[PDB]
Amino acid sequence: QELILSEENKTNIAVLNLGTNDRRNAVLILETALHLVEKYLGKIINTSYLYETVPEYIYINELMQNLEESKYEENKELIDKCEEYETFLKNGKVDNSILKEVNVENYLLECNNIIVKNDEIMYFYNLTVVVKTFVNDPLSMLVVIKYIEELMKIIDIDILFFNDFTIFMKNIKLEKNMIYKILSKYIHLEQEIINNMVDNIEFLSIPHVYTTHRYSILLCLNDMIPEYKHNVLNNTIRCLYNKYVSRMKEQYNINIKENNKRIYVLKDRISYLKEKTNIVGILNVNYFVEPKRAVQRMFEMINEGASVIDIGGESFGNPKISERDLVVPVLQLFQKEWNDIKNKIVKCDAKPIISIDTINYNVFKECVDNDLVDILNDISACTNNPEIIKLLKKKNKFYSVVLMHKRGNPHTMDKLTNYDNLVYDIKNYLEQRLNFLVLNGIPRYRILFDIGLGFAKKHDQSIKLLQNIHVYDEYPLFIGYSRKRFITHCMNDDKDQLLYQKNICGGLAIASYSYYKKVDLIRVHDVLETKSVLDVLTKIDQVKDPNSSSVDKLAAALE
Ligand X SMILES: Nc1nc2c(c(=O)[nH]1)N=C(CNc1ccc(S(=O)(=O)Nc3nccs3)cc1)CN2
Ligand Y SMILES: Nc1ncnc2c1ncn2[C@@H]1O[C@H](COP(=O)(O)OP(=O)(O)OP(=O)(O)O)[C@@H](O)[C@H]1O
Residues placed in the known binding site for ATP: 146, 158-159, 200-203, 205, 208, 210, 214
Which sign does the torsion angle of CA 256, 260, 261, 265 carry? negative
Segment contacting a copy of itself by CB under 8 A, of 46-54, 95-103, 289-297, 547-555: 547-555
Shortest Cβ distance from residue 241 to ligand PH2 (Å)?
Answer: 15
Crossing angle, helix 323-339 and helix 291-303, to 10 degrees?
Answer: 60
Query: Which position among 540, 546, 547, 558 is part of the footprint of a copy of itself (CB under 8 A)?
Result: 540
The 3 state secondary structure assigned to 200-227 is: HCCCEEECCHHHHCCHHHHHHHHHHCCC
The 261-300 contact track toward a copy of itself, x by CB under 8 A, reads ----------------------------------------
Q: Find out whether 157 and 17 touch, Cβ atoms under 8 Å.
A: yes
Peptide bond into 207 cis (omega under 30): yes
Q: Find out whether 488 and 507 touch, Cβ atoms under 8 Å.
A: no
**Cβ proximity to ligand AMP, 94 vs 198, nearer residue:** 198
Rg (CA), the chain: 26
Q: Find out whether 220 and 127 touch, Cβ atoms under 8 Å.
A: yes
Shortest Cβ distance from residue 408 to ligand Y (Å)?
Answer: 49
Segment contacting ligand Y by CB under 6 A, of 65-73, 79-87, 205-213, 291-299: 205-213
Report if residue 153 touches a copy of itself, rule: CB under 8 A.
no
Residue 216: which of ligand PH2, ligand AMP, ligand X, none does it interact with, CB under 5 to 8 A by kind?
Answer: ligand PH2
Residue 402: which of ligand AMP, ligand X, a copy of itself, none does it interact with, CB under 5 to 8 A by kind?
Answer: ligand X
Phi, then psi, of 395 in degrees rounded to 5: -65, -35
> Would you give the DSSP letter of residue 362?
H
Report if residue 256 touches ligand Y, rule: CB under 6 A.
no
Shortest Cβ distance from residue 188 to Ca ion (Å)?
Answer: 15
Q: Find out whether 186 and 36 touch, Cβ atoms under 8 Å.
A: no
Amino acid at 555: A
> What are the start-end ranges of the E strands in 460-551?
478-479, 521-524
Report if residue 209 touches ligand Y, rule: CB under 6 A.
yes
Cα distance between residue 89 and residue 130, in whole Å = 11
Shortest Cβ distance from residue 316 to ligand X (Å)?
Answer: 3
Which residue number has the CB closest to ligand X? 480
Instruction: Assign 557 to helix, strand or coil.
Output: helix
Residue 53: which of ligand AMP, ligand X, ligand PH2, none does it interact with, CB under 5 to 8 A by kind?
Answer: ligand PH2
Q: Footprint of a copy of itself on this chain (CB under 8 A)? A: 305, 421, 423-424, 427-428, 463, 466-468, 470-471, 487, 490-492, 498, 501-503, 505-506, 508-510, 512-513, 516, 528-530, 532-540, 543, 549, 552-553, 555-556
